[PDB]
Amino acid sequence: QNDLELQQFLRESHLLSAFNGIVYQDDQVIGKARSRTLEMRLNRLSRVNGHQDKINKLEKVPMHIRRGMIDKHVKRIKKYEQEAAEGGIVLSKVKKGQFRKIESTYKKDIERRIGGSIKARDKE
Amino acid sequence: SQVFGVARIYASFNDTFVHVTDLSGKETIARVTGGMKVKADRDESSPYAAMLAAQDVAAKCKEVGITAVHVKIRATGGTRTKTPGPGGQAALRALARSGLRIGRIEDVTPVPSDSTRK
């Protein structure tokens, strides 16, 4: 649990597979994997002491296209987890209001624009 | 016009067995495994070793007078992997390329049917 390289590889296994034997260790990680890997590490370090209204700033997207982004992403999520549920496939478990993180989440960089959950419904 | 043996290719990991017997299975014609052709002790399962073993199998089967083989391809089975190693398709390909006609490919690995694990 206190191995740092192992746990960093574990939680950055998704975007290494999205933007790739394979390389995982820094001093061998080429561009978009390197930028998003370093950004993920800096977010995870800064989420302890930084304020929750200041650490995860969403990109300013207009209303009628951010809502369509969210609706198409939720359609992808529902189709994926419904296909896996009618198959046998065991999926990882998410919380109640969060978005399920899928391959299009990691490739399309969708969580910078839509967040991890609708925080108005999370607040209410 | 053909004379038929059977192939009995047992392709585990770590080794492959190309073992032509007669139509009953009681009399053998040139069992040569993979680890006896070229042994680095880890290339025994390799497609090169399976091709060498099937090639001199087919040499001795053409010597005795067998023109075709019914292929029975098995894995280690049991309470284990059930998938044929890298040598099974290579031994089959080398048996077909070295003159022998192929018939009746079938998968006779021992599915354990309620096994003895726990």
């Binding site: 191995d3 296994s13 998704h14 597979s17 990882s92 | 694990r117």
Partner: protein, 230 residues
């Protein structure tokens, strides 16, 4: 050529709207190997047949594995990587390992991982494609990767956590990419050997020798004050 070979799997009903879509790509990817294939949508089956023009004797086996991968619900660009020689399947069996359903689903969810991290790191290290479905584990890959994922999954159904195997896989990759140390044993470098079996109960066995014989007949109950007065 050969005489005739014909394999057939049969697929669950929900898959047919996907298989109907991808089916022309299957016919392209097999007609380059001279293998016919039908998709029956009334009996719900997929058959592959060796035609008159098949000079590869062993490719009907990989076509069989391809159609049962399509039945076991891996997608098409993942599943046509089975038609090449360096890649094969494995179907690990995890149902027959532990007794209670709670411990079974918790060890299987441990095999998947938090957010899928353990499973995705395993796919990356072993170069395989792994599906934890139901009470079995499908996997596609090279044979060294298949050996690795089979030992990982079976030891994960036994009690040892899979991130120990992920750690030793990373250690073994960075230990195999040096030219020396390739004929020495790596057991001093692997932290997998824990030596955690270090308890031994040593009581006096007071009741545990022979206590509490079993009788099938119950004792009577303490009656109420109403019963004690009537």
């Amino acid at each position: 050529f050969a005489e005739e070979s014909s394999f057939m799997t049969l697929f669950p009903k929900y898959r047919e709207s996907y298989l109907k879509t991808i089916w022309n790509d299957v016919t392209r990817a097999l007609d380059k190997h001279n293998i016919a294939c039908v998709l029956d949508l009334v009996e719900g089956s997929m058959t592959v047949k060796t035609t008159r023009k098949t000079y590869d004797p062993a490719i009907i086996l990989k076509a069989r594995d391809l159609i049962k991968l399509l039945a076991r619900s891996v997608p098409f660009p993942q599943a046509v990587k089975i038609l090449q020689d360096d890649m094969a399947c494995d179907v690990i069996k995890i149902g027959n390992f532990v007794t209670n359903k709670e411990r079974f689903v918790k060890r299987r969810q441990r095999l998947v991982g938090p957010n899928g991290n353990t499973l995705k790191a395993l796919e990356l290290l072993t170069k395989c494609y792994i599906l934890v479905q139901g009470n079995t584990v499908s996997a596609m890959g090279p044979f060294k990767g298949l050996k690795e994922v089979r030992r990982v999954v079976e030891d994960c159904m036994k009690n040892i956590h899979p991130i120990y195997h992920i750690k030793e896989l990373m250690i073994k990759r960075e230990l195999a990419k040096r030219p020396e140390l390739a004929n020495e044993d790596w057991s001093r470098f692997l932290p997998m050997f824990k030596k955690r079996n270090v308890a031994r109960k040593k009581p006096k066995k007071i009741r545990n020798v022979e206590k509490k014989v079993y009788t099938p007949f119950p004792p009577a109950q303490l009656p109420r004050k109403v019963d004690l007065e009537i």
